[model samples]
Target: MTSTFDRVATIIAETCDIPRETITPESHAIDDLGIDSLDFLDIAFAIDKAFGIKLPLEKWTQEVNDGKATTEQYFVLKNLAARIDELVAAKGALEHHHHHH
Candidate 1:
């Protein structure tokens, strides 16, 4: 299977109309890639559609915007990739369990 980083990078690259080489695990949606708020919404929607998982985008954004007093940390590119992998694994496990029942 393709790595989560590759998959996510592909999605971001395609969505942002940027070269794949520009995307890295350290890339930030806003600071690094110049993604505006509107672009982020589209990216989030695309991610949901592609991965079949719902991300708490609003909560995530709030945490990111809050420089202090936020329990959740901001999501960087690597963080997003890790989250995607985790969700995929969890979903796969759930599906497998249901199928075996």
Candidate 2:
């Protein structure tokens, strides 16, 4: 297996029509790769197709409004996956808690 980040890199490359050779965890989708709002939705859908984790743009917006997070973090693959796993675990915990009640 290549690794999670590797798959994400490939997906971004395919969706964004960027070179996979240049895609890196440090690459910024907006500043570096020039992804716009419409491109963002395409990339988000690609992610769900590959990993089944829905990109929580709305959550990012809420967090940004709350001054808790910056949407820029979502552009970096490392930070993106870390928070994505956090969300999966968070939702999993919520389901478990609800089941116990």
Candidate 3:
């Protein structure tokens, strides 16, 4: 089975038209991978479709606008990958909890 990290890397690789092997958890979307602002939207869309969860884009944007995070900092691959895994686990847990209720 493909791990969440693999899946996320696949999405990014496809979106950026880069080889999957070039990506890593520590890869920076912009600094390392040359992903531009427009590509960020595509990456976010791919993640949402793959995981069935919406990323907090608005919140992230707000933080960037408020100078809390730079665009590069906000789109760090390691952080994004960790967040996807967290969301998947949380969704599974919530579904399991609801099923027994």
Candidate 4:
């Protein structure tokens, strides 16, 4: 529950309306798990509020989208986890107060 996977997976599970336990770090939320765009929008829309930093969703994700990534290049659970970690490292966690982290 202390790790990014725990946070992201939980959010994805709630956003996609799926079982969290069934997800894994290797799981690709869209292609592999069939997460629909509607849910994806909710996930992205809520990210800034949930994750503390404003993600350059288009700027960053589009990189992977534009590249001819062969496979397994989508935001697999671990990729999102790592990205979250990196952003938090550079940006500082909960840039504002969150009551209690």
Candidate 5:
């Protein structure tokens, strides 16, 4: 499965226009990337689109802002790679399941 932290990093780098190298688990959106509220929403939306998972807005907002994010404390790059791996696995599983059914 894809780790939540990886998805979080992707959202930050892609939607916020921050360099991928700058996104780390310890990096703050406001302090590091200087993202505003709208940018934050863009991050959220990108994450949802990337993962096919809709995160809870209010709760996610709190975690990201409060510096309590990262489901596993992974660096952004590692997390995103993991997410990609997860998507590949999921796609394979879906195809297999459908074939069996």
Candidate 6:
């Protein structure tokens, strides 16, 4: 299974044209990658598609771009992605169960 950190790093690299080395967990999208508001949305969209998770736009807007969210916020987002990955795994498990049963 792909880790959330890896997924996020890939998204940042591909979406913002930033090098993977530049996109550390502590890297700020705006400061580090020079990402603007639109770039953030594109990254979010990529995350949603990659993870099959729907991020609430308003919440993502505040949480991701809000000035108060620190480097720690990156971990929070990664954790959230991990949680969603777990959910997706569970859903697959259930589908497999039904398929077998």
Model 2, range 1-101, lDDT digits (tens) per residue?
Answer: 66567777887788889898888787777777788867877776777667666666766657856989776777777676666666556656657445554
- The predictions' CA RMSDs to the true structure, in order, are 3.6, 4.9, 3.1, 4.7, 6.4, 4.6
Give lDDT tens digits, candidate 4, residues 14-71.
Answer: 8878797788899887778887656766776566568786666666556656775522
Q: RMSD, model 1, all Cα superposed?
A: 3.6
Ranked by TM-score, the better of candidates 3 and 5 is 3
What C-alpha lDDT values do all the predictions have? Answer: 0.73, 0.72, 0.80, 0.70, 0.59, 0.64
Candidate 5: where are CA atoms >4 Å away? 1-3, 58-101
lDDT (Cα, tens digit) per residue for candidate 6, span 1-101: 66767887888689878787766655556555577767767877787788776655456456646775543444344544554566567657656445554
Off by over 4 Å in 4: 68-74, 93-101
Q: TM-score for all predictions? A: 0.76, 0.71, 0.80, 0.75, 0.51, 0.62
> What local lDDT does model 5 show for residue 75?
26
Clashes of 6: 0
Give the lowest summed-lDDT range of ten residues in model 3: 92-101
Candidate 5: 10-residue stretch with minimal lDDT: 71-80
TM-score of 2: 0.71
Q: State, as a TM-score between 0 and 1, how close model 5 is to the true structure.
A: 0.51
Report the number of the highest-lDDT candidate: 3
Cα lDDT tens digits for candidate 5, 1-101: 54666667767766767776777765655555577767666765676677675445566457656888853322233443454455546656656445554
Residue pairs in collision within model 5: 6-79
Give the per-residue lDDT digits (tens) of candidate 3, residues 1-101: 77877888889888989898788888888888888878888888899888898777777768878998886556778777777787787778767445554
Off by over 4 Å in 6: 63-101
Which pairs of residues clash in candidate 4, taking residues 3 or more apart in a chain or in different chains?
none
Residue pairs with backbone overlap in model 3:
none
